[PDB]
Amino acid sequence: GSLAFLPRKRAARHRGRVKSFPKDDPKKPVHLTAAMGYKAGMTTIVRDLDRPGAKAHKKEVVEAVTIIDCPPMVVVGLVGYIETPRGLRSLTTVWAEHLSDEVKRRFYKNWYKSKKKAFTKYAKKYAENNGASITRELERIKKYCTVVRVLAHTQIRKTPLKQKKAHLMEIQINGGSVADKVEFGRSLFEKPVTIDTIFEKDEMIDVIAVTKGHGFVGVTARWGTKQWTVARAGQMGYHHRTSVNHKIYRIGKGDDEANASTETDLTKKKITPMGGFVRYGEVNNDYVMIKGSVPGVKKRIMTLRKSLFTHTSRKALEKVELKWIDTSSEFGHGAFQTAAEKKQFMGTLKKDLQTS
Amino acid sequence: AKSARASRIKENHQRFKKNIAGPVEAARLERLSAKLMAIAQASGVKSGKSIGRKDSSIVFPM
RNA sequence: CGCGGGGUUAAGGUGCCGGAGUGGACGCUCAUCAGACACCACAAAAGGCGUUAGUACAUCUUGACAGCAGGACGGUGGCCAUGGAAGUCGGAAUCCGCUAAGGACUGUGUAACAACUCACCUGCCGAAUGUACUAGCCCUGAAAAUGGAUGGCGCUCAAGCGU
RNA sequence: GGGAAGUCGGCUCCGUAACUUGGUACGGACAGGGGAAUCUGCGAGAUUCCCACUGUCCCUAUCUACUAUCUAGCGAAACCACAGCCAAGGGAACGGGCUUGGCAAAAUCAGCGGGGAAAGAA
RNA sequence: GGGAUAACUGGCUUGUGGCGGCCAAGCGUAGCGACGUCGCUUUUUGGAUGCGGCUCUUCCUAUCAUACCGAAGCAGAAUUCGGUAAGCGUUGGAUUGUUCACCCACUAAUAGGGAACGUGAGCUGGACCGUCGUGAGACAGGUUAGUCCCUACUGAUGAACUCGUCGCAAUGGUAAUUCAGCUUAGUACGAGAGGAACCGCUGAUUCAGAUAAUUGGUUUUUGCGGUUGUCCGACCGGGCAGUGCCGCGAAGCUACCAUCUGCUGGAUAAUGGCUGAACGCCUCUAAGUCAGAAUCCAUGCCAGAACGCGACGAUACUACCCGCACGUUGUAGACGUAUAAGAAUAGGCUCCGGCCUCGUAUCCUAGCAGGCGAUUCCUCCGCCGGCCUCGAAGUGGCCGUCGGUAAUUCGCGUAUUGCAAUUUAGACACGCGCGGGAUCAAAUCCUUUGCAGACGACUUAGAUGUGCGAAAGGGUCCUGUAAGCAGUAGAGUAGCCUUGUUGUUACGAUCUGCUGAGGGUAAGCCCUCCUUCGCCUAGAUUUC
């Protein structure tokens, strides 16, 4: 194996952390770096390729794309860090008012038996004229911090998951003075932010996730065989990975009702496969459609972040003309895009007569 | 074959970054930040203007 | 060399680790893993446009070394040889004049010339130089393969070397 | 059963007529089977592919044998100076305890591929 | 037969022969003698070998390739020699007992070595006596030696610091590699034959990390259908053959048999320069400085110190804050624990006069361990507030009240601790008390989940809900047309009566229709408007 992914250990956290935001300069406009989503599955497409110099130039190619359910995230806080001879130090964080039950579930571990008493005194700090103290915290961030991040959480109760506990993370704000970033976050308080607002189509991003576990597995599969340098038996899988350069092909709006329709296929259909995503369900929200395979199982929490470095390739400056998106069943050898197509192909049936 | 860390390769990458990806990503960021702004704008001691004190060690205790 | 108290020493040390000097005088050495007592080996009549001290010889206000500005000429394109060879592809002699000095030529160059340059000479400059050796310290004077050793830190008008 | 390797592997007889018991001319027959397919309308149906040997190797198949984590209960033995982290040094091809350094934080579970074993010398 | 010796190498080893003559600085006062040159080997026509082999880890450079340089009639292309470089890769055939050489195919190339007397780990292919002889051996003659635990590594849990959420990053690891095609371009170059390169673009090898839309494979979905033997009296529906056999087969798992991704700064080596001394020329070097390799260090990337740190949330008792009573309570060690410019040292400071070896300086420094009163003083402390300030691990200024206060002088008290006996006196911490204010929480077990899993561990849910569970319905997939009945379609098997030119009555394989029906469908598929039923604010432990 590679001595660069060792100490081959299970990921310390299920969420997966960014570990590096792109470097910040004040000249760029104010923007957010990262976002969150849940892996729904993957499907097949056909792209009219414009790669000047390729043998598939001006030809139709079949590609595999991963679909990420991305309900809008909610901003609930703002954290400010300072530079010290020992690194970055979180000087202070100021939250939003009216936190949601899902983020309070994130804070609690046994939510059902608990008195749900989190951040009540903080809301009283807003309401009872301790807004002087809160403004003092904002001004401390303005006048002492060098980098600002925003606290944001996902919407499980829109995601088709049995879970009810949300996911918090800090998304770094770049491109402006610290005062501009503080005002931006304070204005973003108690507001939903969308994936088409953070990213857009044609843009390569980086995906942070925890790759699927397989338990105690021997050297044959753990490293790929026929001291730390010697292949040993142990945990294989469930590993934190940051996979780079994945092209954002589409962002579907969820309420469009024609997410899977292209300018070539005039079929009013959505991204969800016929019968639903296997083991996941239906995508009823904003979704991100990106090229290739991506670390993580279905319904796993995923972090989507901007590229650290300005790109060096023509694959990152290309437009993606889509021809069609596969919506056949993933539960077996499916050959119909819609139930209407299946009915038109197979005619009417005995149960159709019995019901009608 | 030139290594991925070759100086000439790095210089070519720098030129490509500065002359194509620069402008493309600048326009992309302008549009995205416009959308972000759309969604966003959709006594000192007793007021908080004067940043006062809230509420191991580095020095030896005397 | 019995059990104890006090004092003074030896060999070895005095930058704590480590008790005692960042003690004193005069010098030398900067090493791309110096050296800190190994002086046996590699190792030689060895390589060094490193540095210091010294011995011998030689040239100098009769102007030494270095430089700059000029001369570097005539018999003669000397004899032989070569398709061609004029100092300068080659063999052998290698003289004289004018001299201040200039080789029958030390290199570049031409097909052969031509041309430049060196040897040597003069003018300007101005005071000490330059050749070989010797003696210290320093670099090289050959090295493999787990990560490690002046005991370790570290030490450069030393915490290195000599008295 | 399949794949692989090597090969030099693939692709005359009966009756009849004259002649000395045997030959001579004439007439007729001979010089495949099996499996898998494709094409025209079961069809003289037409066309395509594979058939080997080996004291060789590998894989698949069958049989034989040993193969087994936790819980409740029951329940030994081998072996045991004391111990167990490294690198350099410790004249006697000697280190595990010493010098001086790297360091070094309770109690455990599982895997295991290293160490805790070896000479004696003409 | 006796004696000695009983291992042996261990700053060992590598690229340049030996012998004789000539030359030879010196040493010496004949002898030793290097570098060279001459003579021999040696010139006037172009198989050797008599322990081997394979896999993996790590390291060395004495580098085969890839990267960068210096030189060569190096025109171009292809190269040769040399230098820096170990980052990254590094074969097969023939032959032979084996190996090598040579020779032959790929390939970018298909280098050589170490793991220290046991060549890192693993695998594989005899001497003593006796007898008889001795120009010499023989003996089925006897005897004889053959010595499941700790730890490393690799993963997984973890007590105490109240539980939790969000982070930082010391340190440790570290990754990409080679080739090709297009354009440049039939261009530069070349008599011709031939024939590049920089930028730009697109793929492929190996390596690494993931992923399962698709496409193969795998089947205990024992899901569906066919089929063998036997059995349940027959049909139907099924049992047995340790999964009878066959076909398809989702889901899951897999596969360079499938698909995706692999990123940029600084400083350097060889070397090439700039300025310029040594040395009046010169010089890339001495002072100073520019570029430059796949090199070095880092970012990107993995881990996170379980005795490194930060922010935030909620904290029932406890004690969570405050006032002050203390502690026969702890401390690697109060006793004035007093003191902020920056910067240079072949210079600096300033009040702008001047000053600087010198911190043996400045402040502070008196009173029953520091009493009481007065004359006199507006000086130095202190606590609270107000305005502001300090974020590298967070404090100080000004003002305001109130409190204490020898800058001068004086009075009243100190005794007896008996001639010294730590002058028990500071700080931070922790505890126990009082009286004032404030608050009424979580985690674990348990059931559950499968994004996880040897077991712990992990992601979830459990208090009324967009809840959970069991059924059902619909959707989607898998199989392949159920049982039964009927039609003269029906190949066939037989009776009635007499001839049948169309005789009838029964049975009946097989066919067709009802029937893409019937069955299975989450166990790790999808959805549910009141589809139906049921459940639910628990009970045990622990916490400053």
Q: What's the 3-state SS for chain A?
A: CCCCCCCCCCCCCCCCCCCCCCCCCCCCCCEECEEEEEEEEEEEEEEEECCCCCCCCCEEEEEEEEEEECCCEEEEEEEEEEEECCEEEEEEEEECCCCCHHHHHHHCCCCCCCCCCCCHHHHHHHHCCCHHHHHHHHHHHHHHCCEEEEEEECCCCCCCCCCCCCCEEEEEEECCCHHHHHHHHHHHCCCEECHHHHCCCCCEEEEEEEEEEEEEECHHHHCCCCCCCCCCCEEEEEEEEEEEEEEEEEEECCCCCCCCCCCCCCCCCCCCCCCCECCCECCCCCEEEEECCCCCCCCCEEEEEECCCCCCCCCCCCCCCEEEECCCCCCCCCCCCCHHHHHHHHCCCHHHHHHC
CA distance to A68, A247, A249, per residue, from A280 (Å): 11, 23, 21
Interface test with A, best of B12, B39, B41, B45 (most A CBs within 10 A): B39
Tokens, residue A42: 């993957």
CA distance to A124, A210, B29, per residue, from B47 (Å): 17, 46, 37
8 A C-beta contact, residue A149 and residue A31:
no
Question: Which positions of strand E lie within 7 Å of protein CB atoms?
Answer: 55-58, 66-68, 87, 153-157, 163-170, 172-179, 181-182, 198-203, 207-215, 249-255, 259-265, 267, 292-296, 298-304, 308-315, 337, 386-395, 426-428, 440-444, 449, 451-455, 458-463, 466, 468, 474-478, 514-518, 522, 524-527, 538
Among residues A307, A291, A232, the alpha carbon closest in space to that of A34 is found at A307
How far, in Å, CA of A17 to CA of A8, rounded? 17
8 A C-beta contact, residue A38 and residue A296:
no
Strand A34-49 to strand A59-69: parallel, antiparallel, or no bridges (unpaired)? Answer: antiparallel
Q: Which amino acid is residue B56, in one-letter code?
A: S
- From the list A132, A138, A140, which residue is nearest B46 (CB)? A132
* Gap from A128 CA to C132 C1', Å: 102
C-to-N gaps above 2.5 Å in chain B, after residues: 42, 55
Resolution in A: 2.8
How far, in Å, CA of A232 to CA of A9, rounded? 12
| Beta-carbon separation of A175 and B29 below 8 A | yes
8 A C-beta contact, residue A338 and residue A266:
no
Residue A87, beta-bridge partner list: A84
Rg of chain A's alpha carbons, rounded to an integer?
23
Residue A322, beta-bridge partner list: A47
Q: Number of A:B CB contacts under 8 A?
A: 81
How far, in Å, CA of A105 to CA of A170, rounded? 17
Rounded to 10°, the helix B22-40/A178-188 angle is: 50
Among residues A184, A201, A202, the alpha carbon closest in space to that of A193 is found at A184
* Gap from A229 CA to D102 C1', Å: 21
- From the list A28, A30, A310, which residue is nearest B36 (CB)? A30
CB atoms within 10 A of CB A293: 12
Q: Which method was used?
A: cryo-EM
Residues on chain B touching A318 (C-beta within 8 angstroms): none
| Beta-carbon separation of B29 and A31 below 8 A | yes
8 A C-beta contact, residue B34 and residue A184:
no
Tokens, residue B18: 């500065």
Interface test with A, best of B10, B13, B32 (most A CBs within 10 A): B32
- How far the first Cα of chain B sits from its last, in Å, is 65
How far, in Å, CA of A249 to CA of A109, rounded? 38
HEC sequence for chain B? CCCCCCHHHHHHHHHHHHHHHHHHHHHHHHHHHHHHHHHHCCCHHHHCCCCCCCCCCCCCCC
8 A C-beta contact, residue A310 and residue A256:
no
Dihedral angle, C-alpha A59, A60, A65, A70, nearest 10 °: 90
Task: Give me the A residues in range 260-299 that sit within 7 A (CB) of strand E.
Answer: 274-282, 291-299
* Gap from A191 CA to D18 C1', Å: 128
Residues 6+ away with beta carbon under 8 Å from A320: A47, A201, A202, A247, A249, A250
8 A C-beta contact, residue A69 and residue A285:
yes
Q: Which amino acid is residue A197, in one-letter code?
A: T
Residues 6+ away with beta carbon under 8 Å from B56: none
CA distance to A119, A124, A346, per residue, from A98 (Å): 9, 11, 54
Nearest chain A residue to B50 by CA: give it. Answer: A136
8 A C-beta contact, residue A241 and residue A327:
no
Q: Annotation-wise, does A60 bind a ligand? A: no
